[PDB]
Amino acid sequence: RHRTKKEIDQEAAVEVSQLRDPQHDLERVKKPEWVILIGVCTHLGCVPI
């Protein structure tokens, strides 16, 4: 997903440990608006809309 730097600020203005999964936004991909994901919901295997 290509995103916006303002969408990166919307994503990362909330802190890392607020989520139940502690993961920093810059840890997820090196080119930050180009987020690269194994796109399947890790609960029970769905594709989120």
Binding site: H43, L44, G45, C46, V47, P48, I49
Partner: protein, 378 residues
């Protein structure tokens, strides 16, 4: 002497269907054995003819069942008979279970255990048969419940990679599920014979709970023609379902080719799994939710071991009867909440209904039983 009392097969026929001393007190709520048996043999026949025209492959299943319903003569009604006969079999199965819980016949312990194992087997057969048409709903529900089996730590990952045959629901998974749905009703019939064996060890049950050994009428020809009456009632209801409204039960998305990317938003199992599924999505724990389902079936195991009453049935215990009817309404409540999209008031009332289910069957049954007990100078 008498040909029925000499031939060894005819001795089995005589002990099964002629010289069975039956209770004379049982109304139409005891016809369910013959109903489930005739549903089972009709499911055998319909699935057999389907298997004479079905292709177990991911590429060819949808087109082949389309070829059945459009090209093979009467294959459309045979498919409708198989699916709606599964639904009618489920209705009769739930009401057989409801009779067995309401009239106190669950004191028969090992017969109840055999019935629990039969319930396991019918659930598994139902799910894999529903996987077989290679629909979008079947694909995503199989993925979800396969991950539910992968919820087990350190054993579940190897077990799910063992049942895959790949990374996901691919051709190996499709053919393996075809094999298991294709073989299991014979084992269901064998354990049904075991079920019948333990019951004919014990003897059947009347509404009163008092054993009717002074008032035994035979199984023939009274119950034979009464079961014929109930069976042809099932015939007319089932066949009018398959010939007037085929779409009141079947999902619309079930007629779509499987897209491995979509996840349509009203993804759900069929209605006979939604109460199994409403317990899942209203508990924010994967292993906790599947353990809650397994513990619901284990509660159905437990309930013979908590009959702390002094009657047998709830026929003369009206408080426990009213709690039973609240449980009936709560079951239909959980089924309808399984039939809704995930919504916040629906979330609240689904959690309240599931915890109400557990509190009624687990806690409120010995409480109601002991109020009924100590109330009657006991």
């Amino acid at each position: 002497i008498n040909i029925r009392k000499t031939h060894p097969l005819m001795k089995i026929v005589n002990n099964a269907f002629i010289d069975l001393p039956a209770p004379s007190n049982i109304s139409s709520w005891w016809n369910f054995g013959s109903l489930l048996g005739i549903c089972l043999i009709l499911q055998i026949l319909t699935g057999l003819f389907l298997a004479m025209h079905y292709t177990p492959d991911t590429t060819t299943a949808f087109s082949s069942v389309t070829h059945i319903c459009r090209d093979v003569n009467y294959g459309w009604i045979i498919r409708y008979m198989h699916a709606n006969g599964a639904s009618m079999f489920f209705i009769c199965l739930f009401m057989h279970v409801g009779r067995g819980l309401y009239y106190g016949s669950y004191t028969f312990l090992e017969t109840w255990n055999i019935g629990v194992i039969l319930l396991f087997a019918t659930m598994a057969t139902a799910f894999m048969g529903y996987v077989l048409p290679w629909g979008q709903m079947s694909f995503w529900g199989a993925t979800v419940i396969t991950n539910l089996l992968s919820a087990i730590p350190y054993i579940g990952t190897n077990l799910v990679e063992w049942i895959w045959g790949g990374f996901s629901v691919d051709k190996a998974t499709l053919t393996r599920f075809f094999a298991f749905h294709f073989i299991f009703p014979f084992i269901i019939a064998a354990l049904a014979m075991v079920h019948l064996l333990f019951l004919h060890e014990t003897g059947s049950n009347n509404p009163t709970g008092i054993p009717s050994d002074t008032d035994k009428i035979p199984f023939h020809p009274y119950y034979t023609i009464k079961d014929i009456l109930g069976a042809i009632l099932l015939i007319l209801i089932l066949m009018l379902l398959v010939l007037f409204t085929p779409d009141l039960l079947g999902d619309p998305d079930n007629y779509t080719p499987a897209n491995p990317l979509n996840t349509p938003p009203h993804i759900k199992p069929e209605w006979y799994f939604l109460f199994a599924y409403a317990i899942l999505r209203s508990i924010p724990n994967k292993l906790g939710g599947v353990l809650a389902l397994v513990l619901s079936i284990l509660v159905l195991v437990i309930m013979p071991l908590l009959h702390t009453s002094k009657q047998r049935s709830m026929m003369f215990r009206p408080i426990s009867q009213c709690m039973f009817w609240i449980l009936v309404a709560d079951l239909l409540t959980l089924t309808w909440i399984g039939g809704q999209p995930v919504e916040h008031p629906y979330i609240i009332i689904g959690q309240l209904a599931s915890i109400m289910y557990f509190l009624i069957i687990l806690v409120m049954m010995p409480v109601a039983s002991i109020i009924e007990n100590n109330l009657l100078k006991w």
